[PDB]
Design a protein around this ligand. Sequence first.
Ligand code: CL
Lengths: 218, 219
Amino acid sequence: QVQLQQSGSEMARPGASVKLPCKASGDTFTSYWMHWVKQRHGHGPEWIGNIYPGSGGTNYAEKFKNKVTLTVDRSSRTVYMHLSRLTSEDSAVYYCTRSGGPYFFDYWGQGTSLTVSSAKTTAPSVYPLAPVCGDTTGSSVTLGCLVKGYFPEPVTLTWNSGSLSSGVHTFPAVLQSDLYTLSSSVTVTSSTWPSQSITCNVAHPASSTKVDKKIEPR
Amino acid sequence: DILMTQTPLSLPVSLGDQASISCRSSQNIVHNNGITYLEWYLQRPGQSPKLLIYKVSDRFSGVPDRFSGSGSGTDFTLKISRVEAEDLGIYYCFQGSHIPPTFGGGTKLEIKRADAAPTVSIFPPSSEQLTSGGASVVCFLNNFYPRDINVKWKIDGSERQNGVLNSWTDQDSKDSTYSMSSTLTLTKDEYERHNSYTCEATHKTSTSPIVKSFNRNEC
Ligand SMILES: [Cl-]
């Protein structure tokens, strides 16, 4: 039951550099190769290189030979990937995974979403979406949450702090006019709302903002 | 570098039917130790890839036996018998016999299910956004199939095409449906200059669109 711990996301400026961590707990970490893989959207992932924590040693794909450096901290069981001279083409998700035995990559970190941009960070506006005022009650009711005008991605939206997860649809953010906008809908029986509380929680790490919006009848 | 060519790009398959995904390597991928490190991964949007098949035909722990890998030389095949709802996502072949290890371009498996009409809900601007000076009208078209769907916005009976932002969710892993969110953004003044707002969903499940509307000054 090994677990690779990676930071969810990160933003960096062009020309700058970043150092992404991956903590290999559970055990070993010494007798297993650790790999870093890149993935843009849903394209086939791309191997960056690997490092053997046990006796040190690294291998890099030619493409990332001059741009990446892998290091390790044995005392914290953590591997790092240093990416330099960052450009918009480095914007993607970076996974750490391990190889060893008859198969490669049996365990993966959640992946770190990196955004390389010079644009400024903008916290989002979060608007509660209650049904049309006075609409006829049905056996079920659909509520919404609109998160508008933020940068960069991502935001983490939950309902009732994660407690309400079924009947939920959180739509992929869309970029328009340099700012992102996303929405989420949650459907519950009309005996659940407005009788019980339903709140939209939006976290935006880039700006360290955490906003909650209760949904009540108009 | 070994080029892994995977086909098809998209694979629509009926629940219960068999899915067949192909992958060809640009060269021999048998490691010197005699082992062919050809693997198949399955990734759901927003999640890390999961290993399904390794060493060409070995099933990783916990993988249903309806998943089967085969092949040799430069041609490999992943077959999924009796496709189930939870099999959705993008499949990638992978070779780890030669450095650098390389992945195929991926095959997105779409689950075919019975037609389902969307459940449409329209939402007027929240009072908080109005205070801000803007006005977004939201329309949710939930749990429908197939994915092809159209939304048209109308203001006082007249079509409005500018200021619209559409976003589709990824196919549902449980009921195999899709959902779509459409948002019409206006200025508060523009919003207050009209009263009737409408989103009409046109989907193959019906000759006529599903219409949802409201009057701004009504409750
Ligand atoms: Cl105006």
